[PDB]
Amino acid sequence: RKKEFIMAELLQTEKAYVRDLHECLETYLWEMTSGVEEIPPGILNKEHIIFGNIQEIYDFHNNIFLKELEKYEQLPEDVGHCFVTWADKFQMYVTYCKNKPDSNQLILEHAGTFFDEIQQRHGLANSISSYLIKPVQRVTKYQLLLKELLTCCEEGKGELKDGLEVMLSVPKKANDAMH
């Protein structure tokens, strides 16, 4: 029962994370790239700084990671292997984290209310900043879910330990990459 609640949350929150990145890309980002609205000179052609590599993070999750996690739904004790298999893809959170302070200052110093205008217009509860912290949140959350599975799965559970290892290493490496 506990391993099932954790797996369910894993999957449900993965779905929400995919939805959240997708919303960010198709509202805040799409307005910058669209050609429909007035883009401050302070940020023009700097969507790469603002959103960092969030496209590529979304594509990973939306094309691959969510489909694979789903296949482990009835195999919670094995899900650590999913993180082992895909460990290289998580390296992109290192890039994302590195960039995030530059992103935030850029939005602060140079965007005025461009993005707030967009938020009001689309009716979004979450601000551009709220969306852009999410990869940082998600990448530090997987390790908590794996720790919870470790408290309730038997010695058939180096298929959690190695997963957790990977999911402790990625955020530490992102952390250690910051200036």
Partner 1 sequence: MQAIKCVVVGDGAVGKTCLLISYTTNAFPGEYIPTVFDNYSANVMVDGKPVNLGLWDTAGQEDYDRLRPLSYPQTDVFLICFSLVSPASFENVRAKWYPEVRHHCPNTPIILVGTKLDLRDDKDTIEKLKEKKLTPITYPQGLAMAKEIGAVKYLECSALTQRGLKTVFDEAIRAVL
- What's the one-letter identity of residue 86? W
Among 125, 151, 155, 156, binds partner 1 (CB under 8 A): 125
HSE value, Cβ hemisphere, 13 Å, CA-based, for 136 = 16
Q: Which of residues 145-174 bind partner 1 (CB under 8 A)?
A: 145, 148, 171-172, 174
Rounded to whole angstroms, the Cα distance separating 26 from 34 reads: 10
Give the tokens for residue 31: 């307005």
Rounded to whole angstroms, the Cα distance separating 179 from 177 reads: 7
- Window of 4-12, 35-43, 65-73, 84-92 that interacts with partner 1 by CB under 8 A: 4-12
Among 44, 108, 109, 121, binds partner 1 (CB under 8 A): 108
Residue 140: Cβ within 10 Å count:
18
- Window of 3-11, 21-29, 57-65, 70-78 that interacts with partner 1 by CB under 8 A: 3-11
Q: Which of residues 9-38 bind partner 1 (CB under 8 A)?
A: 9, 13, 16, 20
104 binds partner 1 (CB under 8 A): yes
Q: How far is the CB of 138 from partner 1 (least distance, A)?
A: 9
How is residue 127 annotated by DSSP?
-
129 binds partner 1 (CB under 8 A): yes
48 binds partner 1 (CB under 8 A): no
Q: Where are the alpha helices (DSSP H) in the chain?
A: 2-24, 30-34, 47-51, 54-59, 66-71, 80-85, 92-110, 114-122, 128-150, 158-176
Q: Which residues bind partner 1 (CB under 8 A)?
A: 2, 5-6, 9, 13, 16, 20, 97, 100-101, 104, 108, 125-126, 129-130, 133-134, 136-137, 140-141, 143-145, 148, 171-172, 174-176, 178
